[PDB]
């Protein structure tokens, strides 16, 4: 055992014994601002609040209603053959991190293609504050003030408000974000697998060549590698494990992770704290809105960077 | 640089660019419980609140008044020859970590011996948990700790009494009643910059002749203690060059001020002569920072 490995062992053993990040707390009532700050924000600890929201959207947001309310405008949509936008796929003996095929099409076309269980996998996943930038009308059916219990801890308005509408086959592969995340399912349900930052040494991460999904004149999908001016591949660091069916012989370290499963239904709120690993699945035609707030830096970020150094 | 040292250098580089724990925040008024939780508790960030308390004590309490109040009672007094209780001391060519000679003498003699610079260094340290204090003024912090104080300690002592650098595993709310207290503080993540050593523990004892000496303490093979080796006021940067990378903070806390010293922060304390203070300890609520700190301790072992 190296000294670095001994230190990582100490970290994991202490966090296990102290029950750090070992569960998703489940509440039936929205907590006070002080409660949220003390018990979840300051501990970097996820919580799900059941049936917290009765926004008008939760009732009325249907694909048909959205087509009418948005005037059937053209929307940006991501397409993959496999359902893994921003995810690993193999071609000609090489594993790539692949970006989705991104295109524009009328919302009605998106919905028609969500109804074809055979064709390519579609997802309105653009994030980048796509709700407030590209679909501001939708904001009228939300009451963001209801999120105050959490916002007072972040102490700033959302840095992004995002809209998700997805196929059942669209899976978000495990990754982390540098934001505090308040996730609100409007219709259907989302299934989360979550892993806390301090378990970084149990999550295998690899450096992969990057590609993008393109389609041939025949409509056949393939991966086009991104190979830049310097000649080399364009590389991306990405989580290597599939949480739904992990290969513990290939990745012994993942045996030491304790992933947490939570399902979030229409009207539920999920607080996903900054730098938590998450893998996301969804019911068919699931609609969700999420609010991202920039993180307030402390020593835990510096420790996380140190862990990245140690596990490199 | 080795693997462990490359990791520590990454830690310190990231904390230096973000200036983590680079300043003791200064406040004019007592914050809300939410403000304190969001800004200070959750960030492990020390803060000093100026002229925050208007307790009766701050006016009344003196050696003279305390005499008449408790009535010349016998009190728990700590005594040292050098003024370094829980500090390092040399004897027989070997450096020891020495606990204080603890005794019980009546409080009128304490005051007499305080202004004799000829004698030993004395100070009173009591853990009794009154009507001259408005403890509710600290609710803002209590609500963030979500439990009453685990201890309330009274302190009265000599300017010669120096509390050497060390860390505590609890949240500290320090309230100065009379005089001022000088703190040198160091963030926990700078542990690798603070040189530590293993020392044989002892206790101070007086002779037939009243002469002080360190009695090596034992359980046989005698006990040992890990203790910080550097003196922050006159550091030896040639003997301890890693300490050049630490960035200590200095803060003076006056009568009526409140200092929040977060758990596991290194601190070296001094004070004016006959300074009086109280402080409230709260047992920490364990989080990821503590686990990282145990890891960091393993890396600097
Ligand atoms: Mg796998
Ligand atoms: Mn994400
Ligand atoms: Mn202390």
Closest-CA residue to B27 (of B18, B36, B16)? B36
Give the torsion through C-alpha atoms of B250, B255, B260, B264, to 10 deg: 60
Instruction: Report DSSP letters for B217-280, one per residue.
Output: -B--PBPEEEEE---TTS--TTT-GGGGG---EEEEEETT-EEEE-TT-EEEEEE-TTEEEEEE
The CA-based angle A211-A214-A220, given to 5 degrees, is 125
Contacts of A169 (CB under 8 A, 6+ apart): A83, A121
Ranges assigned E (strand) in B158-220: 163-166, 170-178, 180-186, 196-206, 212-216
Answer yes or no: are the C-beta atoms of B151 and B107 closer than 8 Å: no
Q: What single-letter DSSP state applies at residue B137?
A: G
Q: Is A301 on the interface with B (CB under 8 A)?
A: yes
Q: Is A43 on the interface with B (CB under 8 A)?
A: yes
d(CA B147, CA B282): 8
Burial class (CB in 10 A: 0-12, 13-18, 19+), A44: buried
d(CA A262, CA A280): 10
3-class secondary structure, A93: coil
B191–chain A nearest CA distance, Å: 13
Q: Is A241 on the interface with B (CB under 8 A)?
A: no
Q: What single-letter DSSP state applies at residue A30?
A: P
d(CA B294, CA B296): 5
What is the assigned CATH class of domain A3-311? mainly beta
Residue that has been written with the tokens 């990454």 in this structure:
B10
A183-205 burial: b if 16+ Cβ within 10 Å, else e: bbbbbbebbbbbbbbbbbbbbbe
d(CA A5, CA A9): 6
**How many DSSP H helices and E strands does chain B contain?**
7, 18
d(CA A194, CA A182): 14
Asked whether the beta carbons of residue A33 and residue B34 sit closer than 8 angstroms, the reply is yes
Name the residue in chain B with its Cα closest to that of A309: B7
Contacts of B118 (CB under 8 A, 6+ apart): none
d(CA B56, CA B79): 29
> Phi, psi (5° rounding) for residue A123?
-155, 125
Give the torsion through C-alpha atoms of B267, B271, B274, B277, to 10 deg: -40
> Which residues, in sequence order, are bridge partners of residue B156?
B124, B276
d(CA A22, CA A141): 35
Interface of B with A in 247-276 (CB under 8 A): none
d(CA A79, CA A213): 8
Give the torsion through C-alpha atoms of A36, A42, A45, A51, to 10 deg: 10
d(CA A40, CA A149): 11
Q: Quick one: how far is CA A29 from the chain centroid?
A: 25
Domain B3-300 has CATH 3.40.50.720: no
> Phi, psi (5° rounding) for residue B37?
-65, -50
CA of A304 to the centre of ligand 1 (A): 23
- Closest ligand to Cα B125: 3
Q: How was this structure determined?
A: X-ray
Asked whether the beta carbons of residue B291 and residue A33 sit closer than 8 angstroms, the reply is no
Answer yes or no: are the C-beta atoms of A95 and A88 closer than 8 Å: yes
The CA-based angle B285-B259-B125, given to 5 degrees, is 85
Q: Is B60 on the interface with A (CB under 8 A)?
A: no
Q: Is A5 on the interface with B (CB under 8 A)?
A: no
Q: Quick one: how far is CA B12 from the chain centroid?
A: 24
Contacts of B301 (CB under 8 A, 6+ apart): none
Answer yes or no: are the C-beta atoms of B138 and B36 closer than 8 Å: no
d(CA A120, CA A84): 11
3-class secondary structure, A239: strand
The CA-based angle A135-A190-A251, given to 5 degrees, is 120
CA of B290 to the centre of ligand 1 (A): 31
Cα-Cα-Cα-Cα dihedral sign, residues A148, A154, A155, A158: negative
H/E element, A87: strand A87-91
- Count of other CB atoms within 10 angstroms of residue A22: 12
CA of A129 to the centre of ligand 2 (A): 13
Answer yes or no: are the C-beta atoms of B96 and B201 closer than 8 Å: yes
């Amino acid at each position: 055992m190296s000294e670095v490995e001994r230190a990582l062992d100490v970290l994991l053993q202490e966090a296990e014994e102290l029950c750090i990040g070992s569960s998703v707390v489940e509440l039936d009532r929205i907590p006070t601002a002080l409660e949220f700050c003390r018990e979840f924000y300051s501990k970097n600890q996820p919580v799900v609040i059941r049936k917290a929201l009765n926004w008008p959207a939760i009732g009325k947001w249907t694909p048909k209603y959205l087509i009418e309310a948005l005037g059937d405008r053209s929307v940006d949509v991501a397409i993959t053959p496999n359902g893994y936008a921003d995810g690993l796929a193999t071609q000609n003996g090489q594993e790539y991190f692949v970006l989705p095929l991104e295109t524009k099409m009328k919302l009605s076309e998106v919905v028609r293609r969500l109804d074809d269980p055979t064709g390519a996998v579609h997802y309105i996943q653009k994030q980048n504050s796509n709700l407030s930038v590209d679909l501001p009308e939708l904001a009228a059916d939300l009451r963001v003030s209801d999120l105050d219990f959490a916002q007072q801890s972040f102490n700033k308005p959302p840095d992004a408000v995002n809209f998700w509408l997805g196929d059942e086959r669209a899976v978000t592969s495990m990754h982390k974000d540098p934001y505090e995340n308040v996730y609100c399912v409007i219709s259907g349900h989302k299934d989360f697998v979550l892993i806390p930052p301090h378990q970084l040494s149990c999550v295998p991460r690899g450096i992969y060549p990057t590609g993008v999904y393109k389609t041939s004149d025949s409509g056949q999908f393939y991966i086009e590698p991104l190979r830049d001016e310097e000649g080399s591949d364009q590389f991306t660091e990405w989580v290597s494990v599939d949480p739904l069916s992990p290969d513990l012989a290939k990745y012994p370290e993942y045996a030491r992770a304790k992933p947490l499963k939570v399902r979030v239904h229409a009207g539920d709120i999920l607080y996903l704290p900054n730098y938590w690993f998450h893998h996301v699945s969804q019911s068919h035609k699931c609609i969700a809105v999420n609010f991202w707030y920039d993180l307030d830096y402390d020593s835990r970020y510096c420790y996380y960077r140190m862990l990245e150094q140690m596990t490199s």
